[PDB]
Design a protein around this ligand. Structure first.
Ligand SMILES: Nc1ncnc2c1ncn2[C@@H]1O[C@H](COS(=O)(=O)NC(=O)[C@@H]2CCCN2)[C@@H](O)[C@H]1O
Ligand SMILES: Nc1ncnc2c1ncn2[C@@H]1O[C@H](COS(=O)(=O)NC(=O)[C@@H]2CCCN2)[C@@H](O)[C@H]1O
Ligand SMILES: [Mg+2]
Ligand SMILES: [Mg+2]
Ligand SMILES: [Zn+2]
Ligand SMILES: [Zn+2]
Lengths: 463, 463
């Protein structure tokens, strides 16, 4: 039911057009692009506090790409290769970046010299490529990840590195909270960690179809890559030690989930700071004081722009009903309606998208009424969102109880686990599900093998 | 002399790092990225008035790419090809986009139905690829054009199309004028026009090395592509005619020239709206009322941010001289210095980057003093820039006189020309130069064959 809803809203709201001749690569239409634009603004505002945006190349040569042991093995047959330059065969294959470690790190080897240079914190929003699962999924599983934000950091000590992982996690919480997106943070099993890292911390959110979606990962690379690409630095004494690195990223999935999580029957419902417009003004007219209703709306439009609002005056010549539907299915948070009556009173009608509540405010200070309203809509959407998720995270003591709950209610399954490879794999097979990750807490007994369970683990069916 | 200057400033100012293992593909370092960021802001501000930003795929399949006659022949051996997906050979080659006509147009065939749909005006800033001339030139001739802005439009009548070409030209003038970049607008010879178009209008600017650089092109595609990709629309009567299209674009060259044209011995000199910082505050201190000088600067920083300034307080512990040099070689327009004296008077020292003029203003309204100063710096830079260029456009009546002037003074060569293929090619060979384009004006006699010259043509040695 969700799948269809999703696909339809993507088309109706004109977010992306999937009709491109190459499976797994979609086009961002104007509206979609605007949402992507605002989502990225929120993100960069956070990231730019302590990160320096850069922009590295798209292509990587075998020499560099395969310089890693596990990492190269992790994307082995998942990389696209350019082999010819025109009609001639390049004397060195070039791979489209799946992620940029092998692109930036050799460059980092150069940029890093003294401890005075560290720490360095960079990030970029580029397009990456990954040849994967025949099942192509709009903004969730694409071949061309059009909005891949990857951040990479460099530190002097393993200590600061771990500290960074913490900082990153806080950055994502803030990012997500701004989008009103709920999430579960866990430590992925050592066999799922980013190829070559020490460990991976992942953020998973819940889709309306009871399935889980990885919406962000942070990885502690320790000195593994440092040694691979020779990234050393001079200590205050005069020694040469390898740097400690971390990296983390998000993709178009962040946009997928904002659309999905605050979904609706009316269409899109987005956080005010993400919508293409925060306030759409709809003038009501039937050839009665029209010239006055209009000039009232225009005055308002201008007035709102000057206050810093992404406003749009819909003065098209169509029934106000159709207008309501359109801006509503597109996710505009606030609709301001003005007609002869209200007008001849110094007031208007403000309608919420998340609730539907129409209220009456005085155009004589409406600017502040709207801001409050916007703050209110996010909190509500964020709240509702969290309730809906937590109410789907269910505990299980029996491996059988799990299978029942998963199959019948979907959602997330909380449980105690020993944290062993074989035991974990066994759990997944028997339940046909994936172990998202762990959360260190008080002991217990592994839901499967009954041995001592040091971890609180989560389980669910993912994307 | 310029070449070296350029390469050195790119490194010293940390704009791009060219040390990437793949020739023709550079890395945008933090500082460079910021300039690129601001340059694009200026551009988008103009473009977003009547254009809708989108984002299409990077890869195009042979089927689509080769669907054109001349266009495919124009980029034939200039395209990079991905042939394998992992370790398996794709059953359909995919080419990295050199430009996106063959990527968007088939999609346009779908988006366009009724005349009610037209006109459509789109644009995107993506990365394109072109396998060309062994001579790789930073921001001027790269294999990965990291800042390729391409706009494509669709119209109902050939009339509006030409009208669009005019609109585009005005948009670029405004863009460039904002960057204080001078330019010559001409109609490229029909053998140099964009592959498949009706005609190409180009913007060329002059580099400090007396060479010309194409910094922008507008193309009128007529209905050539419309017919190739079947982009028809329903007329108000009920007929189905092919649409009239145009497209235009800029590249990293725009950034190259902003750096080059307002070059300097001290380093970079940029228009206030392009620099990473518009105002850098440098506090002068020698352990005398320090705590007061500092709190005075901080108050100022905050105060400027609130006014909308991209300000930076350099409170590092180093000699104010070194600071002056740094922010000066980086191109910051205004330096505000504060010391015990000036401070105990309610004033500070404001230094210009373009001139060097240091003045004294009252911190009690400095905000407005700076804005004026910024407006002044652009006008000066823009002016100086225009003088320098026009003073290098020299007329020639003799094909020999041309060779003398070109070889001795470089620059642009104005002349009357018949506008014939053979005659033009002959001119180029004999003078070892390129005919930039024409400008319809009063007749005369072709500098070469003495026949009737309908056009005013320009000549120069280009990049
Ligand atoms: N095919 C895909 N389509 C859409 N989104 C996808 C796809 N693959 C990964 N993602 C999303 O991207 C996030 C980061 O990817 S990752 O986990 O492989 N991690 C990395 O690539 C690290 C972190 C950034 C630089 N290197 C993941 O957390 C996930 O949200
Ligand atoms: N290798 C290159 N490196 C850097 N800049 C380059 C390169 N090739 C072209 N340019 C610059 O890009 C501008 C547009 O390119 S063009 O003239 O081929 N025109 C086009 O590609 C049309 C117009 C946009 C969509 N299709 C050109 O006007 C020029 O400024
Ligand atoms: Mg698994
Ligand atoms: Mg030529
Ligand atoms: Zn167990
Ligand atoms: Zn002639």
């Amino acid at each position: 039911e969700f799948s269809e809803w999703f696909h339809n809203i993507l088309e109706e709201a004109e977010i992306i057009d999937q009709r491109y001749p190459v499976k797994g690569m979609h086009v961002w239409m104007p509206h979609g692009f605007m949402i992507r634009k605002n989502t990225l603004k929120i993100l960069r505002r956070i990231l730019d506090r302590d990160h320096e945006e850069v922009l590295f190349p798209l292509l990587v040569p075998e020499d560099e790409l395969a310089k890693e042991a596990i990492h190269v093995k992790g994307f082995e047959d998942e990389v696209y290769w350019v082999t010819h330059g025109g009609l001639s065969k390049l004397q060195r294959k070039l791979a489209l970046r799946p992620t940029s470690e092998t692109v930036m790190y050799p460059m980092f080897a150069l940029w890093v010299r003294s401890h005075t240079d560290l720490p360095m914190r960079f990030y970029q929003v580029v397009n990456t490529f990954r040849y994967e699962t025949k099942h192509t999924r709009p903004l969730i599983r694409v071949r061309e990840i059009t909005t891949f934000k990857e951040a990479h950091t460099i530190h002097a000590t393993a200590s600061e590195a771990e500290e960074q992982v913490e900082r990153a996690v806080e950055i994502y919480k803030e990012f997500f909270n701004s989008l009103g997106i709920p999430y579960l943070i866990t430590r992925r099993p050592p066999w799922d960690k980013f190829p070559g890292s020490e460990y991976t911390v992942a953020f998973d959110t819940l889709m309306p179809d009871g399935k889980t979606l990885q919406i962000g990962t942070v990885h502690n690379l320790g000195q593994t890559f440092a040694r691979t690409f020779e990234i050393k630095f001079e200590t205050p004494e005069g020694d040469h030690e390898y740097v400690h690195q971390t990296c983390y990223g998000l993709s178009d999935r962040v946009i997928a989930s904002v659309i999905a999580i605050h979904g609706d029957e009316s269409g899109l419902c987005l956080p005010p700071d993400v919508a293409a417009h925060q306030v759409v003004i709809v003038p009501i007219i039937f050839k009665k004081a029209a010239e006055e209703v209009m000039e009232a709306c225009r005055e308002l439009r201008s007035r709102l722009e000057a206050a810093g609002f992404r406003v749009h005056l819909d003065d098209r010549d169509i029934r106000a009903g159709r207008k309501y539907y359109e801006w509503e299915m597109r996710g505009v948070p606030l609709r301001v309606e003005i007609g002869p009556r209200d007008l001849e009173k110094g007031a208007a009608v403000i309608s919420r998208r998340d609730t539907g509540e129409k209220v009456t405010a005085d155009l004589q200070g409406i600017e502040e009424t709207l801001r409050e309203l916007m703050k209110d809509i996010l909190e509500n959407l964020r709240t509702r969102a969290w309730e809906r998720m937590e109410s789907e995270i269910r505990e299980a003591e029996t491996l059988e109880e799990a299978s029942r709950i998963v199959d019948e209610k979907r959602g997330i399954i909380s449980f105690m686990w020993c944290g062993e490879e074989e035991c974990g794999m066994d759990v997944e097979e028997k339940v046909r599900v994936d172990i998202l990750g762990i959360q260190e807490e008080g002991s217990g007994t592994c839901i499967n093998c009954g041995r001592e369970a040091p971890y609180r683990a989560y389980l669910a069916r993912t994307y």
